[PDB]
Structure formats: structure tokens, C-alpha cells
């Protein structure tokens, strides 16, 4: 058999769950005497096949 037999069904892998809340901090908050700027960037460390 196969999951393709069903007309409009998609196979499932049953992964995990992680109910965490995190912030993507960005923007600048200006004040009378100072400014607090924040920027968030996604970074990627590539795979180094030999260190």
C-alpha cells in the first residue's frame, strides 16, 4: 500500500514540539539624551568539513 492511495492526504513524520516564545528585537527607541538601537539578523555558521 501507500499514502498516495488517499485522494488528498499527505504523509506525516511526527516531529517534535517546542512551545517557546522569543522576540525578534529591532528598531530604535529615541529619548531626550540617548537612543537605544537594536537590530536582529539571522546568521548561519556553515559546515566545516575539517577544522
Amino acid at each position: 500500500t501507500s499514502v498516495n492511495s488517499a485522494e488528498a492526504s499527505t504523509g506525516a513524520g511526527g516531529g517534535g514540539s517546542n512551545p517557546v516564545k522569543s522576540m525578534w528585537s529591532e528598531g530604535a527607541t529615541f529619548s531626550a539624551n540617548s537612543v537605544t538601537c537594536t537590530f536582529s539578523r539571522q546568521f548561519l555558521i556553515p559546515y566545516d568539513p575539517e577544522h
Partner: protein, 101 residues
Amino acid sequence: EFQHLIENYGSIAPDALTVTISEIAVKDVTDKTGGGVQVTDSTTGRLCMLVDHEYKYPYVLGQGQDTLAPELPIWVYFPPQYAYLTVGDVNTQGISGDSKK
């Protein structure tokens, strides 16, 4: 924000800095069915992070190099590989006159 800064203020000077590395995800790569590769989250994979608070290692930041974070928040940063230059002894390579440190 830069327009607001240069419009509403008379001087600027850095005061404090905070860098937070979060949402870390080390990901294993394996072969995918029908060719290609697929990516799975790693629980045992680790990311080594070292903050050189003591300036033990050579400092390469602040030299105007093409290593900056992306200018737009939609792009992905690819942090540069760390390398440095150090002193040495210049030696001539044979009779050709070429010199290597």
C-alpha cells in the same frame, strides 16, 4: 531612524553595546529520498561561542572589510571566518629573490 537622529539631536557618541545570540539551531544534513539533502534539528549538536572579553586573541574588527552584517533585516548573515596576521622572519626563497614571511 537615522533621519530622526540627525534631525532632532546635536551630537552622538556610543555608550553601551549588547549582543544576544538566540534561537540557536545546530542542524544535521543527511541524504534525501530521490536525491538531494534534507535538514534535521540536532539535540546533541553544539555551537561553540567564545567572547574575547580579555582581548586575548588578535583584533580584526574595525578595518573596513567586507565582513559586515547585512544592511537589511530580511537578509541572512554569514559571519566571516576568523583569521589574523602576525609578525615573522622574511626568508628569501632560493636564488629567485622571492621572499616569504
